[PDB]
Design a binder for this molecule. Structure first.
Ligand SMILES: Cn1cc(C(N)=O)c([C@@H]2CCCNC2)n1
Length: 164
């Protein structure tokens, strides 16, 4: 059973106008099997619109491609993103009063490199409010996190969404 195609696609922005379907494919086939690979072009001039997309056979291949950034394609560093609200911070809710920094770190560090963990406390009492923010060094960590159906941290089923 195949993962949904939408989860296997990478939008590639910032292309060289000389990049073709063929040269984009030759580049990104290094990290997996490509079932689709298109450069977007003007319908009348055929001049590149400077972006395109590739579809891999599996999500693990998408991961491999994202972990191989930066990608220099036909001499230009391009900008791949999963199928955009491009942020590096998440809101994590439902962690109650017993969840600590190391719980959040041990779980979320496997999505990306963590720069800040902020466990929210009440301004008046100092009691934990039951939510936190995690800031990563890169947006793909967040993009991987928010497409999961479930997040279990410290036994709690958590609500996770993009923050600012
Ligand atoms: C969100 N926030 C701001 C402050 C503050 N310093 O005004 C606080 C205090 C710090 C101690 C524990 N929570 C209460 N929490």
């Amino acid at each position: 059973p195949k993962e949904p195609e939408q989860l296997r696609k990478l939008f590639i922005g910032g292309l060289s106008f000389e990049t073709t379907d063929e040269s984009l494919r030759s580049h990104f086939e290094q990290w997996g099997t490509l079932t689709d690979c298109v450069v977007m072009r003007d319908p009348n001039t055929k001049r590149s619109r400077g972006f395109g997309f590739v579809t891999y056979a599996t999500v693990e291949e998408v991961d491999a491609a994202m972990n191989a950034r930066p990608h220099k394609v036909d001499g230009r560093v391009v900008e791949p993103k999963r199928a955009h609200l491009t942020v590096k911070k998440i809101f994590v809710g439902g962690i109650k009063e017993d969840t600590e920094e190391h719980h959040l770190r041990d779980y979320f560090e496997q999505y990306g490199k963590i720069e800040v963990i902020e466990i929210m406390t009440d301004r008046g009492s100092g009691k934990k409010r039951g939510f936190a923010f995690v800031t990563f060094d890169d947006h793909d960590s967040v993009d991987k996190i928010v497409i999961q159906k479930y997040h279990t941290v410290n036994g709690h089923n958590c609500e996770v969404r993009k923050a600012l």
